[PDB]
With several copies, the nearest count.
Chain A
Amino acid sequence: NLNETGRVLAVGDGIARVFGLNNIQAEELVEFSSGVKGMALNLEPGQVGIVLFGSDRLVKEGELVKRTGNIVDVPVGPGLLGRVVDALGNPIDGKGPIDAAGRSRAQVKAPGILPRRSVHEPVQTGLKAVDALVPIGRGQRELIIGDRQTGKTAVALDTILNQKRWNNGSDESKKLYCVYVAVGQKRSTVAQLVQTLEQHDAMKYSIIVAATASEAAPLQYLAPFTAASIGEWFRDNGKHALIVYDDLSKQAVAYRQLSLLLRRPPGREAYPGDVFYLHSRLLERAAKLSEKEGSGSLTALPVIETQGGDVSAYIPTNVISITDGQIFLEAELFYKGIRPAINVGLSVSRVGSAAQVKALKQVAGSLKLFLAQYREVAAFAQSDLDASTKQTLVRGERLTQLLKQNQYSPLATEEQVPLIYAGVNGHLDGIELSRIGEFESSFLSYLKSNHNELLTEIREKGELSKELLASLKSATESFVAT
């Protein structure tokens, strides 16, 4: 044929160089005699460079190669919920075929300037530190960043566990469907993540997309894009999705493998000069659509692993400047007891208040301050200290202690506000530093026993009247003395 078919010139390191395929499309999927697939990234004058999806032991020089006529795509739709798929949307969970609503390309234009609307609805993570200090809105990109083993995945996972509060209800505009993208991780780790979602009945509204460490580099490079299409089905249909990219560091590294083996020019850290574009194409797909276009949402929590805390390395630089803010984790805090290990001074949400439940905003406003003032005077923590700085130390320590939170234990907003209210207003100052944990427990159950009406008003109205404030004040003062 020479137009729809090709002969293998050479093959090695996951690359196969092919003669012919004259009518092929850039980034088109192809199929080799042996059954393995791959995509045509380089179209050159007399040959085509194809990256393979599988072992090259299967490809030989001289072997026939066929077009498929299809740019890479993936099945999409609600049929995927509770399923575990690979980068092309094949079921890997032993649960049978996927029912797709349709198919979507891996590469899709992000919504433009015009069809969007300011981020204004919360993604309630359930984490006191985050929701109060680094609030995330629907359609925002908030990066989770830090060294190995600092709790980056835990933040994402807690956010996914939390969504039950609304996914179990019938109001679809409040629901958050979750897409978790495992890139470069080991299978058992993913298997364990799945078992964990299952135990907290969170799989049923989650989709796992897995391109693990042993899978070919093109599959790891595709998996974020594929997953975004899966999430875009929700966004495009007046629903709301959250996507976790865990992680974009390892995705960059797969793209760098293909780029170097196709002999494209290297730059800083041997990344190709379109590695920025790779991640910006991916992340601008997270958006909050306008009313005209159904008000649907996609919210991204990309993960980046730093090396020795170095945010200046090439990939962290890229992603940091693309997203809307950073949640920064640190080992030092982790060992201190501070978990989740969020460095508050370095974390931000560019969206800010707009994405916060008003109730939480009414108490979180002054929390940001008391902590700022606490970080300046931190060193003064060792005999001759005046009135004001001794006080800043007393609040600071207790407010810091309130933000400690166990894994897999996300808290409702109405549980969050009384705790921060108590802290910020001084009701904790008298209580000794080691008892703040037991205080939280007892105070919540006391409120559920005796003041459930106030909890209910917080949850339902999302705001705090001057009447609520005074009721809270009374309930807090009442419990402190007991």
Chain B
Amino acid sequence: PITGKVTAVIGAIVDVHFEQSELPAILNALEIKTPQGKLVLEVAQHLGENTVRTIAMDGTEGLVRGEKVLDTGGPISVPVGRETLGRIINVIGEPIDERGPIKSKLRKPIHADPPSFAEQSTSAEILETGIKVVDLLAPYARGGKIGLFGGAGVGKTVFIQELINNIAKAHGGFSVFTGVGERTREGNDLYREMKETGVINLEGESKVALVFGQMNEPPGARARVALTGLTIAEYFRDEEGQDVLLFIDNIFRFTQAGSEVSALLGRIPSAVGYQPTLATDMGLLQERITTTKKGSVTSVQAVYVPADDLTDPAPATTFAHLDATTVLSRGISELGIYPAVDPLDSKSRLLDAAVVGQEHYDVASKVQETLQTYKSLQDIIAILGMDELSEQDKLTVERARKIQRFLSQPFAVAEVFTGIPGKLVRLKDTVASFKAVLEGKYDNIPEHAFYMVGGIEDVVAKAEKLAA
């Protein structure tokens, strides 16, 4: 094995000296033995005179000039395959849940080239989620990226957990959840909640892998965690031909970590203090999430907007890769609508006749126009009453009230909290169900029959119970 010596320690930056022409490649992982476990360094530059500059994946208090440094021969590698499910993993691929070692069959490097141009799928296609609002109004692209917007108190984690559940039951695909700069308090909460919900089952089979790069880890760790999570997700695509979900919370935090690393390496910052490699850093991550001939990785990414400035370099660069957005809003939950998805704000590039068919598009567009006219008329309703409305208008407003409530849906994962059995509605059913409403075939049906149900048959069923 190749051996180096530490020559310099400055915070999270460490410099290592190796022997003549024995230097490890940039992005190789190096290892120092510590009384606790191991400090991993990633090679950033070749400084000349047989010295490499590295970024530490952990603290460097205690390092001594001259300490022995091992070259692992490759990039940081992570265990991959089915053995990662229900396990919590850190950036260097170690288990951090005290459940022993991940007896995986392979480890793969976290740095890998994106699928070739020729390897790309030639048509955008929909990933069916089983969630009505999403599938109808802002459908996810298969192998695409979706911006998830909304903070706490909007049932965000339940939304994530239903996608995990639905993709596994509908498409037989696993998920990887990556906390980038995650609050430790919230990883502990997320893990305890995944077990309560069933998406993780210690005694049985889990559906999701957890990879966490905590806020209190050094910039190099927080910048690479996304790639660690991504590699586990990629293996399911390439090796097992699945449609995989990859959750990144928060992608902004991956950006800031990259800013911090860059700054630490002495690079001159670009506009607004970001790293000069802002766009390529983003592309080296995002380009890997895509559809190949074997399968697909689809990524749902929580996006923070600095200062609410959408023109800020971080969101502007992120947004270039997004294909859809799911907007979770307090205004929707205050109305009692779950999932609390804003039906107007949520937008998808794939809402097009070319991709989803003419019917799907026409149905979706009419629904949006209905809710839009409803929104505008809210003001004159609040003071003048419903008497000041034309025949065509008072009917669409009545219909809007129903459409709005029909966009809600019980989730299978939330059954433990609610007692209400959950529904997974198929895309074909969602299109037909709403189409039938828009033409006026369920106008005689009371508004409460559309609340928290699945397909159109669930509406007819409930209406018969609520009358008799």
Complex contact flag A–B (Cβ < 8 Å): yes
Contact between A10 and B192, CB atoms less than 8 A apart: no
Interface stretch, picked from A57-65, A423-431, A435-443, A445-453, is A57-65
Which residues in window 321-352 of A have CB below 8 A to B? Answer: 321-322, 324, 350, 352
By the criterion CB–CB under 8 Å, are A113 and B188 in contact? yes
Q: How far is the CA of A65 from the CA of B270 in the complex (A)?
A: 31
A456 proximal to B (CB < 8 A): no
How far, in angstroms, from A433 to B197 measured CA to CA in the complex? 50
From A182, which residue of chain B is reached at the shortest CB distance?
B117
The verdict on B421 contacting chain A, using a C-beta distance below 8 Å, is no
Smallest CB–CB gap between A186 and chain B, Å?
A: 6
A186 to B283, alpha carbons, bound, how many Å? 8
Q: Return the chain A residue nearest B215 by Cβ.
A: A280
Binary CB contact string for chain A from 15 to 46 against chain B (1 if under 8 A, 0 otherwise): 00100001111110000000000000111110
Complex CA gap A420/B69 in Å reads 63
Binds A, one of B19-27, B157-165, B388-396, B451-459: B19-27
B185–A287 contact, CB under 8 A? yes
Given the complex, which residues of B lie within 8 Å of A260, measured CB to CB? Answer: 267-270, 276
B23 near A217: Cβ-Cβ < 8 Å = no
Establish whether residues B263 and A272, one from each chain, have CB atoms under 8 Å apart when the complex forms.
yes
When the two chains form the complex, which single residue of A45, A187, A250 contacts B117, counting CB atoms closer than 8 Å? A187
Q: Does A190 contact B (CB under 8 A)?
A: yes
| Residue ID in chain A nearest B307 by CB atoms | A312
Chain B residues near A42 (CB, 8 Å)?
Answer: 9-10
A93: which B residues are within 8 A, CB to CB? 117-118
Within 8 Å CB of B279, what residues of A? 184, 213, 250, 253-254, 257
Q: Min CB distance, A352 to chain B, in Å?
A: 8
Please tell me if the beta carbons of A214 and B46 are within 8 angstroms of each other in the complex.
Answer: no
Rounded to whole angstroms, the CA-CA distance of A272 and B12 in the bound complex is 12
Chain B nearest CB from A34 CB (Å) reads 9
From B214, B263, B310, B316, contact of A267 by CB (8 A): B263
Smallest Cβ distance from A198 to chain B, in angstroms? 8
How far apart sit A61 and B50, CA to CA, in the bound complex (Å)? 7
For A26, list chain B residues within 8 Å (CB). Answer: 9, 60-64
- Given the complex, which residues of A lie within 8 Å of B25, measured CB to CB? 57, 60
CB nearest to B27 among chain A residues? A57
Q: Indicate whether B48 reaches chain A with its CB closer than 8 angstroms.
A: yes
In contact, A10 and B115 (Cβ under 8 angstroms): no
Nearest opposing residue in chain A for B99, CB measure:
A114
Indicate if A112 sits at the interface (CB-CB under 8 A): yes
B320 at the interface (CB under 8 A from A): yes
A43 — nearest CB in chain B belongs to which residue?
A: B9
Residue A469 is within 8 A (CB to CB) of chain B in the complex? no
Residue among A41, A195, A281 making CB contact with B122, cutoff 8 Å:
A195
Asked if B218 CB lies within 8 Å of chain A CBs, one says yes
Q: Which of A158-214 contact B (CB under 8 A)?
A: 184, 186-188, 190-192, 194-195, 210, 212-214
Q: Report if A261 contacts B (CB, 8 A).
A: yes
A241-262 at interface with B (beta carbon < 8 Å): 250, 253-254, 256-257, 260-262
Q: Which of B7, B21, B262 contacts A273 (CB 8 A)?
A: B262
Chain A CB within 10 A, most for which of B118, B259, B304: B118
Q: Is A12 an interface residue (CB 8 A)?
A: yes
- Determine the distance from Cα of A312 to Cα of B307 in the docked complex, in whole angstroms: 6
Q: Is B462 on the interface with A (CB-CB < 8 A)? A: no
Contact residue among B7, B47, B287, B306 (Cβ-Cβ distance under 8 Å from A214): B287
Cβ–Cβ contact B46 & A61, under 8 A: yes
The answer to whether A24 touches B287, judged by C-beta atoms less than 8 angstroms apart, is no
Contact assessment for B276 and A257 in the assembled complex, using a CB-CB cutoff below 8 Å? yes
Whole-angstrom distance from the CB of B264 to the nearest CB of chain A? 4
Contact B270 A307 (CB under 8 A): no
| B267-A284 in contact (CB<8A) | no
Closest to A110 in B: B216
Q: Could you tell me if A191 and B259 are in contact, using CB atoms closer than 8 angstroms?
A: no
Q: Which residues of A contact B64 (CB under 8 A)?
A: 23-26
A118: CB under 8 A from chain B? yes
What is the chain A residue whose CB lies nearest that of B256? A276
Verify B66–A23 contact, CB threshold 8 A. yes
> Which residues of the other chain, B, contact A236 by a CB distance below 8 angstroms?
none
Query: How many Å lie between the Cα of A395 and that of B192 in the bound state?
Result: 41
B260's contact among A188, A191, A277, by CB below 8 Å, is which?
Answer: A277
Complex: A438 Cα to B411 Cα, angstroms:
44
Given contact pairs A42-B10, A114-B188, A280-B215, A12 touches B60 in the complex (Cβ within 8 A): no
Among B10, B214, B273, B280, the residue within 8 A (CB) of A44 is: B10
Q: Which residues in window 269-316 of A have CB below 8 A to B? A: 269-270, 272-274, 276-277, 280-281, 283-285, 287-288, 307-308, 312
- Nearest-neighbor residue (CB-CB) of A317 within chain B: B306
Which residue among A195, A283, A321 has the maximum number of chain B CB atoms within 10 Å of its CB?
A321
> By the criterion CB–CB under 8 Å, are B97 and A113 in contact?
yes
CA distance A22 to B212 in the complex (A): 36
Which chain A residue lies CB-closest to B58? A109
Say whether B35 faces chain A, with CB atoms less than 8 Å apart: no
Q: Cβ of A274 and Cβ of B273 under 8 Å apart?
A: no
Given A92-B117, A93-B117, A270-B270: A113 and B124 interface contact (C-beta under 8 Å): no
Instruction: Determine the chain A residues whose CB is within 8 A of the CB of B96 once the complex forms.
Output: 112-114
Contacts of A266 in B (CB 8 A): 268, 270
Known contacts A281-B216, A307-B316, A214 near B283 by CB under 8 Å = yes
Check A256 against B270 for contact (C-beta < 8 Å).
Answer: yes
Q: Is A116 an interface residue (CB 8 A)?
A: yes
Q: Could you mark each residue 276-314 of chain B with 1 if its beta carbon is under 8 Å from any beta carbon of chain A, else 0?
A: 111110111011101100000000000010110011000
In the assembled complex, the CB of A136 is this many whole angstroms from the nearest CB of chain B, namely: 13
- The answer to whether A216 has its CB under 8 Å from any CB of chain B is yes
Contact assessment for A44 and B287 in the assembled complex, using a CB-CB cutoff below 8 Å: no
Closest Cβ of chain B: how far from A134's Cβ, in Å? 14
Contacts of B261 in A (CB 8 A): 273
Q: Are the C-beta atoms of A273 and B59 separated by less than 8 Å?
A: no
**Which one, A59, A71, A191, A284, contacts B62 given CB within 8 A?**
A71
Given contacts A13-B267, A61-B48, A270-B270, contact A116 B185 (CB under 8 A): yes
B23 adjacent to A61 (CB under 8 Å): yes
A411 within 8 A of B: no
Q: Which residues of A contact B21 (CB under 8 A)?
A: 61-62
CB proximity to A under 8 Å, residues B83-127: 88, 96-98, 111, 113-118, 120-124
A12 touches B320 (CB 8 A): no
Q: Are A264 and B11 touching (Cβ within 8 A)?
A: yes
Q: Mark B25-52, 1 if CB is under 8 A from A, else 0.
A: 1110000000000000000111110100
Output the nearest chain B residue to A191 by Cβ-Cβ distance. Answer: B120
Contact with A along B300-339 (1 / 0, CB 8 A): 0000101100110000100111000000000000000000
Within 8 A of A (CB), among B174-199: 183-185, 187-189, 191-192
Bound-complex Cα distance A227 to B113 (A): 24
Question: Which of B15, B66, B116, B216 has the most C-beta atoms of chain A within 10 angstroms of its own C-beta?
Answer: B216
User: Does B152 reach chain A (CB closer than 8 Å)?
Assistant: yes
Is B357 at the interface (CB under 8 A from chain A)? no
As a 0/1 sequence over residues 74 to 105 of chain A, the CB contacts with chain B under 8 angstroms (1 = contact) are: 00000000001000000011100000000001
The minimal Cβ–Cβ distance linking B254 to chain A, given in whole angstroms, is: 13
Interface residues of A (CB under 8 A from B): 8-13, 17, 22-27, 41-45, 55-57, 59-62, 71, 84, 92-94, 105, 107, 109-114, 116-119, 139-140, 148, 184, 186-188, 190-192, 194-195, 210, 212-217, 250, 253-254, 256-257, 260-270, 272-274, 276-277, 280-281, 283-285, 287-288, 307-308, 312, 317, 321-322, 324, 350, 352
Q: Which 10 A-B pairs have the closest CB atoms?
A: A273-B263, A213-B283, A12-B45, A10-B48, A195-B122, A191-B120, A260-B276, A214-B287, A284-B216, A268-B273
Question: Can you list 11 contacts pairing A with B, beta carbon distance less than 8 Å?
Answer: A11-B46, A43-B63, A61-B50, A62-B20, A107-B61, A139-B185, A253-B279, A254-B280, A270-B269, A283-B216, A284-B184
Residues of B within 8 A of A (CB): 7-12, 15, 20-21, 23, 25-27, 44-48, 50, 53, 59-66, 88, 96-98, 111, 113-118, 120-124, 143, 152-153, 183-185, 187-189, 191-192, 212, 214-216, 218-219, 256, 259-271, 273, 276-280, 282-284, 286-288, 290-291, 304, 306-307, 310-311, 316, 319-321
